[PDB]
Design a protein around this motif. Structure first.
Motif, PDB file in Angstrom:
ATOM      1  N   UNK A 182       0.833  -1.198   0.000  1.00 51.42           N
ATOM      2  CA  UNK A 182       0.000   0.000   0.000  1.00 51.42           C
ATOM      3  C   UNK A 182       0.865   1.243   0.000  1.00 51.42           C
ATOM      4  N   UNK A 183       0.950   1.911  -1.143  1.00 53.59           N
ATOM      5  CA  UNK A 183       1.740   3.123  -1.229  1.00 53.59           C
ATOM      6  C   UNK A 183       0.815   4.316  -1.411  1.00 53.59           C
ATOM      7  N   UNK A 184       1.321   5.500  -1.087  1.00 52.93           N
ATOM      8  CA  UNK A 184       0.566   6.746  -1.212  1.00 52.93           C
ATOM      9  C   UNK A 184       1.562   7.879  -1.473  1.00 52.93           C
ATOM     10  N   UNK A 185       1.306   9.062  -0.928  1.00 57.12           N
ATOM     11  CA  UNK A 185       2.223  10.181  -1.127  1.00 57.12           C
ATOM     12  C   UNK A 185       2.658  10.730   0.217  1.00 57.12           C
ATOM     13  N   UNK A 186       3.660  11.600   0.199  1.00 57.22           N
ATOM     14  CA  UNK A 186       4.143  12.178   1.438  1.00 57.22           C
ATOM     15  C   UNK A 186       3.129  13.154   2.024  1.00 57.22           C
ATOM     16  N   UNK A 187       1.981  13.292   1.356  1.00 60.34           N
ATOM     17  CA  UNK A 187       0.914  14.173   1.826  1.00 60.34           C
ATOM     18  C   UNK A 187      -0.325  13.406   2.279  1.00 60.34           C
ATOM     19  N   UNK A 188      -0.315  12.085   2.105  1.00 57.59           N
ATOM     20  CA  UNK A 188      -1.421  11.236   2.553  1.00 57.59           C
ATOM     21  C   UNK A 188      -1.061  10.751   3.968  1.00 57.59           C
ATOM     22  N   UNK A 189      -2.037  10.256   4.713  1.00 56.87           N
ATOM     23  CA  UNK A 189      -1.756   9.761   6.049  1.00 56.87           C
ATOM     24  C   UNK A 189      -2.718   8.639   6.400  1.00 56.87           C
ATOM     25  N   UNK A 190      -2.364   7.870   7.421  1.00 59.43           N
ATOM     26  CA  UNK A 190      -3.190   6.751   7.832  1.00 59.43           C
ATOM     27  C   UNK A 190      -2.314   5.567   8.201  1.00 59.43           C
ATOM     28  N   UNK A 191      -2.843   4.678   9.027  1.00 59.35           N
ATOM     29  CA  UNK A 191      -2.080   3.523   9.443  1.00 59.35           C
ATOM     30  C   UNK A 191      -2.927   2.275   9.457  1.00 59.35           C
ATOM     31  N   UNK A 192      -2.381   1.226   8.851  1.00 54.66           N
ATOM     32  CA  UNK A 192      -3.020  -0.078   8.757  1.00 54.66           C
ATOM     33  C   UNK A 192      -2.304  -1.068   9.662  1.00 54.66           C
ATOM     34  N   UNK A 193      -3.070  -1.863  10.393  1.00 54.74           N
ATOM     35  CA  UNK A 193      -2.484  -2.883  11.250  1.00 54.74           C
ATOM     36  C   UNK A 193      -2.590  -4.184  10.465  1.00 54.74           C
ATOM     37  N   UNK A 194      -1.458  -4.818  10.168  1.00 50.33           N
ATOM     38  CA  UNK A 194      -1.479  -6.086   9.435  1.00 50.33           C
ATOM     39  C   UNK A 194      -1.063  -7.180  10.410  1.00 50.33           C
ATOM     40  N   UNK A 195      -1.983  -8.098  10.693  1.00 50.54           N
ATOM     41  CA  UNK A 195      -1.706  -9.163  11.646  1.00 50.54           C
ATOM     42  C   UNK A 195      -2.203 -10.536  11.239  1.00 50.54           C
ATOM     43  N   UNK A 196      -1.578 -11.547  11.832  1.00 48.74           N
ATOM     44  CA  UNK A 196      -1.887 -12.947  11.582  1.00 48.74           C
ATOM     45  C   UNK A 196      -2.438 -13.578  12.858  1.00 48.74           C
ATOM     46  N   UNK A 197      -3.662 -14.091  12.787  1.00 45.18           N
ATOM     47  CA  UNK A 197      -4.295 -14.694  13.951  1.00 45.18           C
ATOM     48  C   UNK A 197      -4.635 -16.160  13.719  1.00 45.18           C
ATOM     49  N   UNK A 198      -3.886 -17.077  14.352  1.00 46.35           N
ATOM     50  CA  UNK A 198      -4.144 -18.510  14.178  1.00 46.35           C
ATOM     51  C   UNK A 198      -5.519 -18.911  14.696  1.00 46.35           C
ATOM     52  N   UNK A 199      -6.118 -19.902  14.040  1.00 46.05           N
ATOM     53  CA  UNK A 199      -7.434 -20.416  14.410  1.00 46.05           C
ATOM     54  C   UNK A 199      -8.403 -19.264  14.632  1.00 46.05           C
ATOM     55  N   UNK A 200      -8.565 -18.438  13.600  1.00 48.88           N
ATOM     56  CA  UNK A 200      -9.447 -17.275  13.644  1.00 48.88           C
ATOM     57  C   UNK A 200     -10.904 -17.651  13.420  1.00 48.88           C
ATOM     58  N   UNK A 201     -11.539 -18.096  14.494  1.00 49.35           N
ATOM     59  CA  UNK A 201     -12.940 -18.484  14.465  1.00 49.35           C
ATOM     60  C   UNK A 201     -13.823 -17.237  14.446  1.00 49.35           C
ATOM     61  N   UNK A 202     -14.793 -17.237  13.543  1.00 50.91           N
ATOM     62  CA  UNK A 202     -15.706 -16.121  13.398  1.00 50.91           C
ATOM     63  C   UNK A 202     -16.982 -16.344  14.210  1.00 50.91           C
ATOM     64  N   UNK A 203     -17.488 -15.270  14.805  1.00 48.35           N
ATOM     65  CA  UNK A 203     -18.717 -15.350  15.576  1.00 48.35           C
ATOM     66  C   UNK A 203     -19.801 -14.481  14.942  1.00 48.35           C
TER      67      UNK A 203
END
Lengths: 245, 50
Positions: free
Chosen positions: A103-124
């Motif tokens: 995910x690229x943008x410009x030196x004038x854009x902003x924001x933060x994404x959390x990228x994580x891995x969760x084992x046995x990700x059961x949905x409720x």
């Protein structure tokens, strides 16, 4: 020298000039199953380069209001390339993964994404709202495939658990003012040496914006988030006819 | 004779053209070596500066 990187595996190579190092899940590299942990007796097949390569499966658009998405592994690849075929023809499967979120943008854009891995990700489910109804999530929500699925209630990860503690899992952040990608290496995680690539999803990949995307009128408004991943040390056993589910 | 320093230490007159490159024998096309996956930071062969 920590900002620049090249990931080469199979007939594919990835480059990035704005990286933030690499994370190795639980501090251990993927590996093949030892003869003492194994239990099934048939000789496994290890395709190597034809399946341990980078696959770019999907692109999502990051919007000022986006809530976040998730993908299930190995579900995302079960119908792609040679890897998919092997997962379909064999009962048993095991592998590691190299995940590279772009995910690229410009030196004038902003924001933060959390990228994580969760084992046995059961949905409720939200249990009918009142919680008096014992509903269950549908197949397209537990195993969304390559298109992934959008989180309905990110704060609780759609499973009654605080996303604020998701960092206890192998993760990285994509802070636009800092880096334009996240790279996480995941070893095979399970209580069994091998398992079905179709009935069991070992872990889920979550990409959630914690600090909203923002920019001024006039700057490129289309900010894609692309998901590229590569299996590592793929092994297969229990051969028979192909099955999709 | 020469006595002032700038004259003694000058390179005026060097007839030896320094060469940055040299020829190597190449009777056949280069071979290809085995290679494996590389997942490193810092190393980046693919990126150039034309």
């Amino acid at each position: 020298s920590d900002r620049v990187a090249q990931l080469t595996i199979g007939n594919s190579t990835i480059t990035t000039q704005e990286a933030a190092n690499i994370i190795v899940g639980y501090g251990e590299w993927p590996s093949y199953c030892s003869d003492s942990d194994a239990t099934a007796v048939d000789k496994p097949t290890r395709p190597d380069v034809s399946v341990n390569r980078f696959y770019t499966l999907d692109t999502k658009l990051w919007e000022k209001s986006s809530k976040g998405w998730y993908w299930k592994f190995p579900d995302v690849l079960t119908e792609t390339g040679v890897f998919g075929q092997n997962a379909q023809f064999h009962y048993l499967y095991r592998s590691g993964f190299c995940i590279h979120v772009q995910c690229n943008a410009s030196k004038f854009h902003q924001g933060a994404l959390l990228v994580a891995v969760l084992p046995e990700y059961v949905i409720g489910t939200v249990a009918g709202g009142t919680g008096t109804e014992d509903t269950h999530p549908p197949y397209k929500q537990t195993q969304p495939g390559a298109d992934g699925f959008e989180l309905q209630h990110p704060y609780v990860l759609d499973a009654g658990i605080p996303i604020s503690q998701l960092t206890v899992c192998p993760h990285q952040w994509i802070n636009l003012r800092t880096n334009n990608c996240a790279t996480i290496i995941v070893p095979y995680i399970n209580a069994l040496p091998f398992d079905s690539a179709l009935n069991h999803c070992n872990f889920g990949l979550l990409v959630v914006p914690i600090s909203p995307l923002d920019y001024d009128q006039g700057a490129t408004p289309v900010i894609p988030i692309t998901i590229t991943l590569a299996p590592m040390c793929s092994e297969f056993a229990g051969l028979r006819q192909a099955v999709t589910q | 004779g020469d006595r002032v320093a700038d004259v003694i230490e000058s390179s005026i007159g060097d007839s030896v053209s320094r060469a940055l490159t040299h020829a190597l024998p190449a009777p056949t096309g280069q071979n290809t070596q085995v290679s494996s996956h590389r997942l490193d930071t810092g190393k980046v062969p693919a990126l150039q500066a034309a």
